[PDB]
Amino acid sequence: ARRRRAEVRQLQPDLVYGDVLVTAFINKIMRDGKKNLAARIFYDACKIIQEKTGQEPLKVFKQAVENVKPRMEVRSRRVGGANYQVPMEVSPRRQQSLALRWLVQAANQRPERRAAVRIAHELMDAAEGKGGAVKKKEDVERMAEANRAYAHYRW
Amino acid sequence: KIRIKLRGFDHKTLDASAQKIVEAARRSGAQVSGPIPLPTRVRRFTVIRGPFKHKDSREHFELRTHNRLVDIINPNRKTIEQLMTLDLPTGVEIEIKT
Amino acid sequence: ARKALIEKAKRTPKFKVRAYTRCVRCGRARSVYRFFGLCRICLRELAHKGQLPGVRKASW
Amino acid sequence: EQYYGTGRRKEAVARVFLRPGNGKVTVNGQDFNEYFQGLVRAVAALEPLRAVDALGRFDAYITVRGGGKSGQIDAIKLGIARALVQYNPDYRAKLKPLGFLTRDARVVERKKYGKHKARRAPQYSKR
Amino acid sequence: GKGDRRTRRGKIWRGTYGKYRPRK
Amino acid sequence: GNKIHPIGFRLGITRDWESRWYAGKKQYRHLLLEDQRIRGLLEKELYSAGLARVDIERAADNVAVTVHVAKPGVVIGRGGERIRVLREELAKLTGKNVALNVQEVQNPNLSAPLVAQRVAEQIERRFAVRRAIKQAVQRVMESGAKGAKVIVSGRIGGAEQARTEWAAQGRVPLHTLRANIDYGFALARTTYGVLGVKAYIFLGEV
Amino acid sequence: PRSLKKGVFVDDHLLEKVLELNAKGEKRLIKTWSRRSTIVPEMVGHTIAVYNGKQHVPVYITENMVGHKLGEFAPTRTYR
RNA sequence: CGUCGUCAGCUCGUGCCGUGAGGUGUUGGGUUAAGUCCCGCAACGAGCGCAACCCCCGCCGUUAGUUGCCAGCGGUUCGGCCGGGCACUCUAACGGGACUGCCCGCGAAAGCGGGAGGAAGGAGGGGACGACGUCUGGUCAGCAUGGCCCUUACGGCCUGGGCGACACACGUGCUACAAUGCCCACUACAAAGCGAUGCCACCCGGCAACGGGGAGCUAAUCGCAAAAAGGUGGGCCCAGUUCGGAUUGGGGUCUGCAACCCGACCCCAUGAAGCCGGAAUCGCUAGUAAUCGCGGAUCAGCCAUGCCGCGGUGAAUACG
Numbered sequence A: 001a002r003r004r005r006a007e008v009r010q011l012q013p014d015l016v017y018g019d020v021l022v023t024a025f026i027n028k029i030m031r032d033g034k035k036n037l038a039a040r041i042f043y044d045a046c047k048i049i050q051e052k053t054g055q056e057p058l059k060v061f062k063q064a065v066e067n068v069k070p071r072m073e074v075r076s077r078r079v080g081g082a083n084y085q086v087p088m089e090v091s092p093r094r095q096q097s098l099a100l101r102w103l104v105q106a107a108n109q110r111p112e113r114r115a116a117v118r119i120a121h122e123l124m125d126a127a128e129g130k131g132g133a134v135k136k137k138e139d140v141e142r143m144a145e146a147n148r149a150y151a152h153y154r155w
Numbered sequence B: 001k002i003r004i005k006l007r008g009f010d011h012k013t014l015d016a017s018a019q020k021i022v023e024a025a026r027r028s029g030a031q032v033s034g035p036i037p038l039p040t041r042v043r044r045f046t047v048i049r050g051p052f053k054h055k056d057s058r059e060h061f062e063l064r065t066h067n068r069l070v071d072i073i074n075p076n077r078k079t080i081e082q083l084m085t086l087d088l089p090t091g092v093e094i095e096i097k098t
Numbered sequence C: 001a002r003k004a005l006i007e008k009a010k011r012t013p014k015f016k017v018r019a020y021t022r023c024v025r026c027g028r029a030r031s032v033y034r035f036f037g038l039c040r041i042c043l044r045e046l047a048h049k050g051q052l053p054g055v056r057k058a059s060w
Numbered sequence D: 001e002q003y004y005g006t007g008r009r010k011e012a013v014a015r016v017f018l019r020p021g022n023g024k025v026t027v028n029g030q031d032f033n034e035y036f037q038g039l040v041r042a043v044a045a046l047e048p049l050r051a052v053d054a055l056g057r058f059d060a061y062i063t064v065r066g067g068g069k070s071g072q073i074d075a076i077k078l079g080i081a082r083a084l085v086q087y088n089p090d091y092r093a094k095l096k097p098l099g100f101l102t103r104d105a106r107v108v109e110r111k112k113y114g115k116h117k118a119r120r121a122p123q124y125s126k127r
Numbered sequence E: 001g002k003g004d005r006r007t008r009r010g011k012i013w014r015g016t017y018g019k020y021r022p023r024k
Numbered sequence F: 001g002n003k004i005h006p007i008g009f010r011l012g013i014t015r016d017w018e019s020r021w022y023a024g025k026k027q028y029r030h031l032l033l034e035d036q037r038i039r040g041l042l043e044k045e046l047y048s049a050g051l052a053r054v055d056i057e058r059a060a061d062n063v064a065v066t067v068h069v070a071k072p073g074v075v076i077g078r079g080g081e082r083i084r085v086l087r088e089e090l091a092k093l094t095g096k097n098v099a100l101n102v103q104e105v106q107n108p109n110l111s112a113p114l115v116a117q118r119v120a121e122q123i124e125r126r127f128a129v130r131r132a133i134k135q136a137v138q139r140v141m142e143s144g145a146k147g148a149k150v151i152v153s154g155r156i157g158g159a160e161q162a163r164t165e166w167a168a169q170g171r172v173p174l175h176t177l178r179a180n181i182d183y184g185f186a187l188a189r190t191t192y193g194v195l196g197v198k199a200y201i202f203l204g205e206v
Numbered sequence G: 001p002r003s004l005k006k007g008v009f010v011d012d013h014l015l016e017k018v019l020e021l022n023a024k025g026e027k028r029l030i031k032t033w034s035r036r037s038t039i040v041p042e043m044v045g046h047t048i049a050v051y052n053g054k055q056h057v058p059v060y061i062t063e064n065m066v067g068h069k070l071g072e073f074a075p076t077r078t079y080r
Numbered sequence H: 001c002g003u004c005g006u007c008a009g010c011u012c013g014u015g016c017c018g019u020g021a022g023g024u025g026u027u028g029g030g031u032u033a034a035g036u037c038c039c040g041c042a043a044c045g046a047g048c049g050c051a052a053c054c055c056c057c058g059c060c061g062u063u064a065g066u067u068g069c070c071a072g073c074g075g076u077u078c079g080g081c082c083g084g085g086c087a088c089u090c091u092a093a094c095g096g097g098a099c100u101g102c103c104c105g106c107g108a109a110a111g112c113g114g115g116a117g118g119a120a121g122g123a124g125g126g127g128a129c130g131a132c133g134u135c136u137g138g139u140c141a142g143c144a145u146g147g148c149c150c151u152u153a154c155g156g157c158c159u160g161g162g163c164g165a166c167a168c169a170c171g172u173g174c175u176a177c178a179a180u181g182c183c184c185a186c187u188a189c190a191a192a193g194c195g196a197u198g199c200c201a202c203c204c205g206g207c208a209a210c211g212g213g214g215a216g217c218u219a220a221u222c223g224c225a226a227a228a229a230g231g232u233g234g235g236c237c238c239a240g241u242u243c244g245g246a247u248u249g250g251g252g253u254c255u256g257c258a259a260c261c262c263g264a265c266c267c268c269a270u271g272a273a274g275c276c277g278g279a280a281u282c283g284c285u286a287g288u289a290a291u292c293g294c295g296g297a298u299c300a301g302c303c304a305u306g307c308c309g310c311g312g313u314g315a316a317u318a319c320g
Ligand SMILES: [K+]
Pocket: none
């Protein structure tokens, strides 16, 4: 991207919750372009959340995402021989990209045999404030500021 | 019921043999079923441009065999004449399975 | 093409197996296209001259 | 009496015949749900109708050939959208903004030479 | 997988037929 | 090494084939091997007539043919004594029994194949290359033509180091697929080795 | 997983030279260029020198080896 | 032919400047994918390049119906099967169509940012096409060619070996390590191609490879033909395991004069390593990557997991 500024491409709203944020999560889940299988997995998850929870899955989904979004992160920058971990804000766009990516990654780290259970349970532990996803988010933010000494290298 | 098969390599050489057979028969036979297209059969030849190595160059060549149908119903004797010795194309081949 | 191994025209292979295409123009024995009897090199040479009827440059 | 569009996508031809009725949809002599058996996407195919409050005021006989089911689903998406305008040309005033009238032009890019898959280039070493 | 001679997908990949993939 | 043969590149438009005979996957290779045998002889002798082109049409054992030369007479002969021997040389080659028309090249200086042959000969007689080229481009440019160019290979003048002499005038847009440019290539044996000669003439656009 | 079909192959060079040589009985040595040929019953006891491309190796044929080609006893290459 | 590369750029004619090499033009502001265009200039123009003219894909219309329809109707062996019709879909020739034209905003202009119509905008998407030249680059084993050398052998014919060797090292790939998976069923939806000494429907025998026998096709009529991934159902439960199929033993089918060295293919056994890969490092900006299968050339057969194409499903991300 040396010329333009590659504009964010819009996604087709969910075929159920009619949410773009959902298609997104589905895309991350998807592997080898098997968007059907991807779709099913996510849905059985919204279902499993309906089960163990008397709350609309869509609301749980959101909440979860929100808790995994990193509002700060460290970025490497070479200055004077060595490389310094410079902490800096995180654009909204990237927070979303990061939150969803981590949810799926954290979810697939889980122990439950069935894919749907994993996303479901990860999504829950997420909106709760726990789970491997939220840790990554926290281990990152802890990383930032832990290097606030270099915050003047704004970047 | 005259089955007419026209094949070739030029799509003008054939359309110039489906015209010397479309009007020179609408004055002695049925209203005739216009020249019918018929999908082509392409044959690709992919060759490595250079004499030695360089297997990543390659150029593409092909032999496109166009087709035509016509099919004039009602031989009528008089039709089988306006179309006896009144053609022109040299890069064409004709067939008749009436 | 070693004008002596161009005994392919022999037709008396003892066993039809030993029969091998071989170029009609170069003697080139390794890329002889059945349809043209030519090798990939000459097949490209003549096609450029328009001496191979119908054969054009494909593109899509 | 009857209205019809077409719609095509990624090489999938769709013949759409809309006739007033309940809401039944026949795809190749099969229930909509029969043809698109368990394809989360399918739902989409009829989005144009819902885009103008039809569906429950129409019925549709659909033909299809060429491609894959999701591609066919997109074609159907256009047919229904076209006929739905032939019925009433004032419907464009709504389907346009949703781009339901547009024929997605995206197609399988050609496979180039010296390249595994059109763009994917071969991997090399010790350079 | 595609490498299992005596299996369904195995025969397909190897472009053959047999007990594990008859011609209907 | 770049640039496709400007003819093979323009077969689609501005430039027809040199054999308009159809065939099927069983005979094509034969009727082809035949044409070559034909051009093989035609050129092996009619050299002196200066043969620019040689078309070959067919319909079924009635092998049309033709031969566009600059000096018809050389073909014909006393009344037609040569055009006789040869005409029989064709059916003796291939018991096809075929015609053998003769078109005259209005101007042998607007036919790249000749212009090439031209310079190619001079080279063997030891004419100064650069001159020939300069001149040749003129002959072509004087007698019409919106552009022209000539290229000789290397060992120019018997030199050990192979070079490449240029020379060209007017337009010669090879990238423009419509130029209608005649291209002619002439070899050129020599005591010390081969020299290649290419000729380009741009005449009319659309 | 061996194979050949119905019609065991054996070059007739040595064949009509062996089954015929069985008339008087046996003999010392033979010399063939038919690795191709299968070893058949009527050879047991013979000593067929096989060519390997450079040499004519002396192969003593036995019951247990009836079925194997002659080439299998005349190794082509030379390693360490 | 490859390469620097589709990177822009390389030049000329006359004039002007300089004793001269050589400058100016081609520099400079704006703009473009571009020496693209604009404005300005001792320069005015031009040539090879850029672009355009050619091909493919996207929308619509003519002309044309032994492929399409029952859309329309009437016969039904309820099979577009028959009548019948070109509407539709296709097939394939020819045209239309997009021009920053239209609207608002900025600008000296070119043009930039949006907005409306439109299938499609501002190079629609992909090809073909690669300047003056460089590498003293590749190739005398494709051919052609100067010189040199051998001309009972550096020529020629065979049979058999070899190019397939194996302590070892690297490149490119294939199949995997599994549950977003592997099986077995059962069901769908492709596109481009190939088919006389051939594709091979269908029938019989064989677990099968394949063998008998034979319908139709010189193929939009018949055949390769099943597409696979998917979808429904069922099994496996997390294990070197219903993951993975390497090795090796045995029995066979084929092609071929002939499968030891040295062929694929089938069936029963065997069931290796591998649990996701150190330092390093590769591809790709969207129908692209990833993934799924299908056809071709060569060719008897084949060591195709190569190669050249085809279509299905279909992302992530680009601050800068
Ligand atoms: K274009």
